[PDB]
Design a protein around this ligand. Structure first.
Ligand SMILES: *[C@@H]1O[C@H](CO)[C@@H](O[C@@H]2O[C@H](CO)[C@@H](O[C@@H]3O[C@H](CO)[C@@H](O)[C@H](O)[C@H]3NC(C)=O)[C@H](O)[C@H]2NC(C)=O)[C@H](O)[C@H]1NC(C)=O
Ligand SMILES: *[C@@H]1O[C@H](CO)[C@@H](O[C@@H]2O[C@H](CO)[C@@H](O[C@@H]3O[C@H](CO)[C@@H](O)[C@H](O)[C@H]3NC(C)=O)[C@H](O)[C@H]2NC(C)=O)[C@H](O)[C@H]1NC(C)=O
Ligand SMILES: *[C@@H]1O[C@H](CO)[C@@H](O[C@@H]2O[C@H](CO)[C@@H](O[C@@H]3O[C@H](CO)[C@@H](O)[C@H](O)[C@H]3NC(C)=O)[C@H](O)[C@H]2NC(C)=O)[C@H](O)[C@H]1NC(C)=O
Ligand SMILES: *[C@@H]1O[C@H](CO)[C@@H](O[C@@H]2O[C@H](CO)[C@@H](O)[C@H](O)[C@H]2NC(C)=O)[C@H](O)[C@H]1NC(C)=O
Ligand SMILES: *[C@@H]1O[C@H](CO)[C@@H](O[C@@H]2O[C@H](CO)[C@@H](O)[C@H](O)[C@H]2NC(C)=O)[C@H](O)[C@H]1NC(C)=O
Ligand SMILES: *[C@@H]1O[C@H](CO)[C@@H](O[C@@H]2O[C@H](CO)[C@@H](O)[C@H](O)[C@H]2NC(C)=O)[C@H](O)[C@H]1NC(C)=O
Ligand SMILES: *[C@@H]1O[C@H](CO)[C@@H](O[C@@H]2O[C@H](CO)[C@@H](O)[C@H](O)[C@H]2NC(C)=O)[C@H](O)[C@H]1NC(C)=O
Ligand SMILES: *[C@@H]1O[C@H](CO)[C@@H](O[C@@H]2O[C@H](CO)[C@@H](O)[C@H](O)[C@H]2NC(C)=O)[C@H](O)[C@H]1NC(C)=O
Ligand SMILES: *[C@@H]1O[C@H](CO)[C@@H](O[C@@H]2O[C@H](CO)[C@@H](O)[C@H](O)[C@H]2NC(C)=O)[C@H](O)[C@H]1NC(C)=O
Ligand SMILES: *[C@@H]1O[C@H](CO)[C@@H](O)[C@H](O)[C@H]1NC(C)=O
Ligand SMILES: *[C@@H]1O[C@H](CO)[C@@H](O)[C@H](O)[C@H]1NC(C)=O
Ligand code: MET
Ligand SMILES: [Zn+2]
Length: 902
C-alpha cells in the first residue's frame, strides 16, 4: 500500500467548497534583490469519506502560520481532530496535514494558512513582469496558473474537476490598480497597518477551476465599452499603449465576438464583466482566465500606422480563441488533462467562427486549412505521432500534463472537430453542443459526454443519417494516430484507404485497435457539380459509381478539405483536373485548388505520385488571382528552394516562378492603382503580399524597381514612411539586397530607434538580405552585442543571415567558431541552441556538408550542446534525408523547370 502523499493524483476523500485568498505582492526588491509576495488563505472543504490526513497542493511556498503550517477548524458545530504534524512533500507538490483522528463524512472544515513565496520573473503562479516606461523600469504582479501553478500562489486542491468559489483580496500599493476574475466589491480601502497600501476585495467567483484564477497589480489603463446587456468590456494595457490607441481594434471586435458565442452556444456569457490585458513579453502567448484573459502585447494590441493586415488577423483570431473558452473549457471543464485536446482543439476550431462574425468579409473560416489542417498533417504523417486521446492514468506528473499542449492537441483537435461539425451539419452540432453546455454547466466532463449529447441530437432527427454512432466514428479519429490517404481509380470508381506516411520506408510500431482503418466522410464534386455525400466504411477497399468517370469528365474528393485526409487519383483524373484549372479554374472551389497542390506534393514525398505530377499541379497558377492556391505552392516549394538555391537547378526554378507570378504582379499593379491602395478584403491583401514577395525574391525586374523606388523615397524622407505595412518585409529586404552600405546603415539607424516590436522585427530581418559578405559578417558581429541586438533576438538574427544564400557559409562559420558561448548563454538566458542549429544546418544536402556536421560534433569533448543536444542529432538525420532526396530528385526537377520556364 503506497502512501497517498506519494501519489500524483489527489485523494477523493475531501472536496473543496470555497476559498478565501488574500495576496500581497511586494514590487520592491528586499535589497538582497529578492521580490516576494505574502498570502493568507482559508479553504472550506467537505469530507466525503473518513480520513485522518489532509492532502492539498503546495509548491514553493514557505508557511508562517502560527503553530503548525495550517490551522484547522470545524464549520458550524463540527468538532475537528487535533493536528499531529504538517509536512511538505516536494516531489508530488503536497502540503500534508496528519491528524490525530478522522474527519467525518458529511462534515465541513475550514483550513487556514499563512505563507509567502518568491515573486519571481518566471511566468508561473503569482509572478513579476518587468518592463520599461521611458527612464524607469516598471514591475507588475500577475498570474499564470495553467496548468499546475495555482498551488504556487496558495495551497489548493489544484485539479481541474475540483471546482469551488473563490473570494480574492489583493493588498497593493494605493496608486496601483488591482484586477481579478470578478469585479471589485467596491472602492479599495487603506491597509490599517500601512495606508500606503490599499485593500481590494473582489466579488465571489462562480464555481470554477483553480487553473483559471487570475489577479494582477499594475499601473495599466483601459479602454471600455458596456455591451447592451450591461456586460462591461475593457482592454487593459500600458498607459502609453492605451494613449496611442493601440487597444481600439481589440475593443472593436470583443463585443461582436462575445455576442456571437452567446448565440452559438445558446448560453449567456456567464460573468458580469470581460477584461483582457496586454502584457509585454508574456511568453505563454495567451491564457483564458475566466473574466480576465491575458495576452502578450503583440497579440492583443494593434497599431494601424505600422501593423500589417496579417497582424490584424492574429488579433481577432487570438481574441476569438480565448473568448471561446469562456464557455467551452471554463463553464464546462474537462475533468482531466488527458482530454486537453478537446478543450484546445475546440477553441482552435471556433476561433475562426467567432472571428468571422467580427470580420464577415474576410472569409477567415478558410484559413483553418493552411493554418491547422495541413500544418498538423506534416507531423501526424509520421511514425512518431500519437493519438489525440491518452489514457487518464498515463497523465500524472506536471511534466506529463505539459506534454498535452502540442500541435496534435490544438491543430488535429481543431481539424477533427471541424470534420465532425461538417458531417453532422452545423445546426445539428450546435444543438448537441448546447445540450452538453446546459447539462454540465459549472461541472466537469470527458469527451464521451460531448459524443453522447451530439448522439442525442442525431437521434432526435431524421435527415442526417450516419453509418455508425458518433462515438464509433470519432473513435477512429481519436484512439489511433495519423490519417488515411484516400486513393481513387476513376476508371472503375474503386476507392481505398491506407495510413498515410510521408516516408514510404517508415516502420510504424504503434499498434491500433483498428488496424489503421478509418470511417471516412467523403464529399465530392464532379465536373463542378456537388455529388451525394459518401461514407467509406472501415474497409481497405470499396467501390462506388460516384467515383467512376467517363474520359472527358473529372471528379474531386473532400470539398473544402473538411475531412481529415489527403486524396490521390489515377493519372488520367489528375490530368483532367489540371486541364480544368488551366481553362476555367472557377469551377473548382478555391480551397480545393490549394488542396490539389498540398496533397500532390505530400504524395510525391511519399512516392505515391511522381514529383513532376506535383509540379504540373502548379502550372495553372499563372491565371490564379487568389491567396490560398498560391500559398500552397509557396509552402510546398520552400523546400525545393532550400535544397536547390545553390545549384544549377535554381536558374530555371526562378525563371519558372517569374513566369508564373508576373501576370499576378501585373494584376495587382492595375488593381492597386500603381500600388497606391491595397485590395479591400483580407484574402486579396494576403495574395498581393505573396505575389510581391514571390516576384521580388525571384528577380522580376518590375518588383525590383518598385522596391528600390519606395526605399529611395523613404530614405529621402525618413519621417514619412511611404511603404504600406503589408509590403514592408519584402520591400525592405529587396531594397537592401540591391543596395550597399547606404541602404544598410539607414535601415540600421531605423532599427535602433524603432519603438514598435513588429517594425523592429521586419528591419532586423531585412538587414540580413544584403548581398555584401562584409555587411553580413559585420552584422553577425553585432548579434552577440546586447547593446546592439537583444539577446532574445540573437539567434533569430543569425538564422536570418543563414537564410541568405550568401550568408549561409558566414553563419555556419560563425556558429562553429563561437560555439564556446554555450558557456556564456546556457546560463545567460536560455538562448535556444536548438533553433539556431536547425536554422543554420537546414540547407545541408551533401555528403561533404554531412562530413562537416560530423566534424563539428567532434567537439563533444566538452561544453556539449545544451538544449540543442538532440537538435544536433536531428540535423545529422535530416542531412542524411536531404542527401537522399536530392539524389533521387535533382535530375527530374531540373528538367521539369527547364521545360516549363519558356
Ligand atoms: C472569507 O471572507 C469573507 C469576507 O471578509 C468573510 O465574511 C465576512 O465576515 C466579516 C467579518 O467576519 C463580516 O463583516 C462584518 O463583521 C462584523 C464584525 O465586527 C459583523 O458585526 C458584521 O456581521 C459584518 N458587517 C456587515 C455590514 O455585514 C461580513 O459579514 C462577511 N462578509 C460577507 C458575509 O460577505 C468570511 O467569514 C471569510 N471566511 C472565513 C471562513 O473566515
Ligand atoms: C523560504 O525559505 C527558504 C529557507 O529558509 C529561504 O531560502 C533561503 O534564502 C536565504 C536568503 O535568500 C539564504 O540564506 C542566506 O542568505 C544570506 C543573505 O540573505 C547569505 O549571506 C547566505 O549566503 C545565505 N545562506 C547560505 C547558507 O548560502 C538561503 O540560501 C536559503 N535557504 C535554503 C535552505 O534554501 C527562502 O528565501 C524563503 N522564501 C521566501 C520567498 O520567503
Ligand atoms: C474601430 O471601429 C471604428 C468604427 O467602425 C473604426 O473607426 C473608423 O476608422 C476608419 C479609419 O480611420 C475611418 O475610416 C476612414 O477614415 C479616413 C480618415 O481620413 C476617411 O478618409 C474616411 O472617410 C473614413 N471612412 C469611413 C467609412 O468613414 C472611419 O472614420 C472610422 N469610423 C467611425 C465610425 O468612426 C476604427 O478604425 C476601428 N479601429 C481599428 C483599430 O480598426
Ligand atoms: C466567499 O464569499 C461568499 C459570498 O459572501 C460566501 O458565501 C456565503 O457562505 C456563507 C457561509 O457558508 C453562507 O451562509 C452565505 O449564504 C453565502 N453567501 C452567498 C451570497 O452565497 C462564502 O462562504 C465565502 N467563502 C469562504 C471560504 O468564506
Ligand atoms: C506610484 O507611487 C510610486 C512611489 O511614489 C511611484 O514610483 C516612483 O516613480 C519615480 C518616477 O516617477 C521613480 O523614480 C521612483 O523610483 C519610483 N519609486 C518606486 C519605489 O518604484 C510611481 O510612479 C507611482 N505610480 C503611479 C501610477 O502614480
Ligand atoms: C437557446 O435556443 C433556444 C431554441 O432556439 C431559444 O429559444 C427559442 O427562441 C426563439 C427565438 O425567438 C423562439 O421563437 C423559440 O420558440 C424558442 N424555442 C424554445 C424551445 O423556447 C433560446 O432563446 C436560446 N437561449 C439563449 C440563452 O440563447
Ligand atoms: C465532476 O462532474 C460531475 C458531472 O459530470 C459531477 O457529478 C455530478 O454532481 C452533481 C452535483 O453533486 C449531481 O447533480 C450529479 O448527479 C452528478 N453527476 C454524475 C455523478 O454523473 C461531479 O461532482 C464533478 N466532480 C467534482 C469533484 O466536482
Ligand atoms: C476494383 O476492385 C475489384 C475487387 O472487388 C477488382 O476486381 C477483382 O479482382 C480480383 C483479382 O483477382 C478478381 O479475382 C475478382 O474476381 C475481381 N472482382 C470482380 C471483377 O468483381 C478490380 O481489379 C479493381 N480495379 C482496380 C483496382 O482498378
Ligand atoms: C467551400 O468554401 C467556400 C468558401 O471558401 C464556400 O463559399 C462560401 O459559401 C458561403 C455560403 O454559401 C457564403 O456565405 C460565402 O460568401 C461563400 N464564399 C465564397 C468565396 O464563395 C462554399 O460554400 C464551400 N462549399 C461547400 C460545398 O461547403
Ligand atoms: C524498417 O524495417 C524494415 C525491415 O524490412 C527495414 O528494411 C527498414 O530499414 C526499417 N526502417 C526504416 C526506417 O525503413
Ligand atoms: C467559368 O466558370 C464559372 C463558374 O462555373 C462561370 O460562371 C463562367 O461562365 C465561366 N467563365 C468563363 C469566362 O467562361
Ligand atoms: C500553453 S500556455 C497558454 C495558455 C492557453 N491554454 C493557450 O492555449 O494559449
Ligand atoms: Zn485555448
Amino acid at each position: 500500500q503506497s502512501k497517498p502523499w506519494n501519489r500524483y493524483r489527489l485523494p477523493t476523500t475531501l472536496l473543496p467548497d470555497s476559498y478565501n485568498v488574500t495576496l500581497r505582492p511586494y514590487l520592491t526588491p528586499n535589497a538582497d534583490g529578492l521580490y516576494i509576495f505574502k498570502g493568507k488563505s482559508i479553504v472550506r472543504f467537505l469530507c466525503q469519506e473518513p480520513t485522518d490526513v489532509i492532502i492539498i497542493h503546495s509548491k514553493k511556498l514557505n508557511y508562517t502560520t502560527q503553530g503548525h503550517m495550517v490551522v484547522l477548524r470545524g464549520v458550524g458545530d463540527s468538532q475537528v481532530p487535533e493536528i499531529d504534524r504538517t509536512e511538505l512533500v516536494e516531489l508530488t507538490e503536497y502540503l500534508v496535514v496528519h491528524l490525530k483522528g478522522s474527519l467525518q463524512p458529511g462534515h465541513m472544515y475550514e483550513m487556514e494558512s499563512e505563507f509567502q513565496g518568491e515573486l519571481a520573473d518566471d511566468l508561473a503562479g503569482f509572478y513579476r513582469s518587468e518592463y520599461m516606461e521611458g527612464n524607469v523600469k516598471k514591475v507588475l504582479a500577475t498570474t499564470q496558473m495553467q496548468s499546475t501553478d495555482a498551488r504556487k500562489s496558495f495551497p489548493c486542491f489544484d485539479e481541474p474537476a475540483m471546482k469551488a468559489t473563490f473570494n480574492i483580496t489583493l493588498i497593493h500599493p494605493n496608486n496601483l490598480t488591482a484586477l481579478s476574475n470578478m469585479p471589485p466589491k467596491g472602492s479599495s480601502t487603506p491597509l490599517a497597518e500601512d495606508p500606503n497600501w490599499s485593500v481590494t476585495e473582489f466579488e465571489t467567483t462562480p464555481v470554477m477551476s483553480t487553473y483559471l484564477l487570475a489577479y494582477i497589480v499594475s499601473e495599466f489603463q483601459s479602454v471600455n465599452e458596456t455591451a447592451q446587456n450591461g456586460v462591461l468590456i475593457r482592454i487593459w494595457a500600458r498607459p502609453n499603449a492605451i494613449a496611442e490607441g493601440h487597444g481600439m481594434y481589440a475593443l472593436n471586435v470583443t463585443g461582436p465576438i462575445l455576442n456571437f458565442f452567446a448565440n452559438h452556444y445558446n448560453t449567456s456569457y456567464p460573468l458580469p464583466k470581460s477584461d483582457q490585458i496586454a502584457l509585454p513579453d508574456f511568453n505563454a502567448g495567451a491564457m483564458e482566465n475566466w473574466g480576465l484573459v491575458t495576452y502578450r502585447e503583440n497579440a492583443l494590441l494593434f497599431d494601424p500606422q505600422s501593423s500589417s493586415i496579417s497582424n490584424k488577423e492574429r488579433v481577432v483570431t487570438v481574441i476569438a480563441h480565448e473568448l471561446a473558452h469562456q464557455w467551452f473549457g471554463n463553464l464546462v471543464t474537462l475533468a482531466w488533462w488527458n482530454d486537453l485536446w478537446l478543450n484546445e482543439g475546440f477553441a482552435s476550431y471556433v476561433e475562426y467562427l467567432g472571428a468571422d462574425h467580427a470580420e464577415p468579409t474576410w472569409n477567415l473560416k478558410d484559413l483553418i486549412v493552411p493554418g491547422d489542417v495541413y500544418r498538423v498533417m506534416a507531423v501526424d504523417a509520421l511514425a512518431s505521432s500519437h493519438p489525440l486521446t491518452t489514457p487518464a492514468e498515463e497523465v500524472n506528473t506536471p511534466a506529463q500534463i505539459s506534454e498535452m499542449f502540442d500541435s496534435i492537441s490544438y491543430s488535429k483537435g481543431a481539424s477533427v472537430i471541424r470534420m465532425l461539425s461538417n458531417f453532422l451539419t452545423e445546426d445539428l452540432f450546435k444543438e448537441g453542443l448546447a445540450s452538453y453546455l446546459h447539462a454540465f454547466a459549472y461541472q466537469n466532463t470527458t469527451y464521451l459526454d460531448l459524443w453522447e449529447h451530439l448522439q442525442k441530437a442525431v437521434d432526435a432527427q431524421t435527415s442526417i443519417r450516419l453509418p455508425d454512432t458518433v462515438r464509433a466514428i470519432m473513435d477512429r479519429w481519436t484512439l489511433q494516430m495519423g490519417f488515411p490517404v484516400i486513393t481513387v481509380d476513376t476508371k472503375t470508381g474503386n476507392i481505398s484507404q491506407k495510413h498515410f506516411l510521408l516516408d514510404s520506408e517508415s516502420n510504424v510500431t504503434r499498434s491500433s485497435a483498428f488496424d489503421y482503418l478509418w470511417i471516412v466522410p467523403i464529399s465530392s464534386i464532379k465536373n463542378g457539380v456537388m455529388q451525394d455525400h459518401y461514407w467509406l466504411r472501415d474497409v481497405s477497399q470499396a467501390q462506388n459509381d460516384l467515383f467512376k468517370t467517363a474520359s472527358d469528365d473529372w471528379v474531386l474528393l473532400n470539398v473544402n478539405v473538411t475531412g481529415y485526409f489527403q486524396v490521390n487519383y489515377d493519372e488520367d483524373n489528375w490530368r483532367m483536373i489540371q486541364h480544368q484549372l488551366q481553362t476555367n479554374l472557377s469551377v473548382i472551389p478555391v480551397i480545393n485548388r490549394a488542396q490539389v497542390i498540398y496533397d500532390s506534393f505530400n504524395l510525391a514525398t511519399a512516392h505515391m505520385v511522381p514529383v513532376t505530377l506535383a509540379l504540373d499541379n502548379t502550372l495553372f497558377l499563372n491565371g490564379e488571382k487568389e491567396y490560398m492556391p498560391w500559398q500552397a505552392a509557396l509552402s510546398s516549394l520552400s523546400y525545393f528552394s532550400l535544397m536547390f538555391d545553390r545549384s544549377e537547378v535554381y536558374g530555371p526554378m526562378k525563371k519558372y516562378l517569374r513566369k508564373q507570378v508576373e501576370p499576378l504582379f501585373q494584376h495587382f499593379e492595375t488593381l492597386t492603382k500603381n500600388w497606391t491602395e491595397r485590395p479591400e478584403n483580407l484574402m486579396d491583401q494576403y495574395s498581393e503580399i505573396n505575389a510581391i514577395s514571390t516576384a521580388c525574391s525571384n528577380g522580376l525586374p518590375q518588383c525590383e524597381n518598385l522596391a528600390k523606388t519606395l526605399f529611395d523615397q523613404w530614405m529621402s524622407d525618413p519621417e514619412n514612411n511611404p511603404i504600406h505595412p503589408n509590403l514592408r518585409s519584402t520591400i525592405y529586404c529587396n531594397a537592401i539586397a540591391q543596395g550597399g552600405q547606404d541602404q544598410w546603415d539607414f535601415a540600421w539607424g531605423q532599427l535602433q530607434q524603432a519603438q514598435l516590436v513588429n517594425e523592429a522585427d521586419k528591419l532586423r530581418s531585412a538587414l540580413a538580405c544584403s548581398n555584401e559578405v562584409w555587411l553580413l559578417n559585420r552584422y553577425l558581429g553585432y548579434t552577440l552585442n546586447p547593446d546592439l541586438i537583444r539577446k532574445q533576438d540573437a539567434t533569430s538574427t543569425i538564422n536570418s543571415i543563414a537564410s541568405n544564400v550568401i550568408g549561409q557559409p558566414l553563419a555556419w562559420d560563425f556558429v562553429q567558431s563561437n560555439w564556446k558561448k554555450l558557456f556564456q548563454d546556457y546560463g545567460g538566458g536560455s538562448f535556444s541552441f536548438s533553433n539556431l542549429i536547425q536554422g543554420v544546418t537546414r540547407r545541408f544536402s551533401s555528403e561533404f556538408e554531412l562530413q562537416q556536421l560530423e566534424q563539428f560534433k567532434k567537439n563533444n569533448m566538452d561544453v556539449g550542446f545544451g538544449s540543442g543536444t538532440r537538435a544536433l542529432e536531428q540535423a545529422l538525420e535530416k542531412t542524411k534525408a536531404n542527401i537522399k532526396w536530392v539524389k533521387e530528385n535533382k535530375e527530374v526537377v531540373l528538367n521539369w523547370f527547364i521545360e516549363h520556364s519558356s
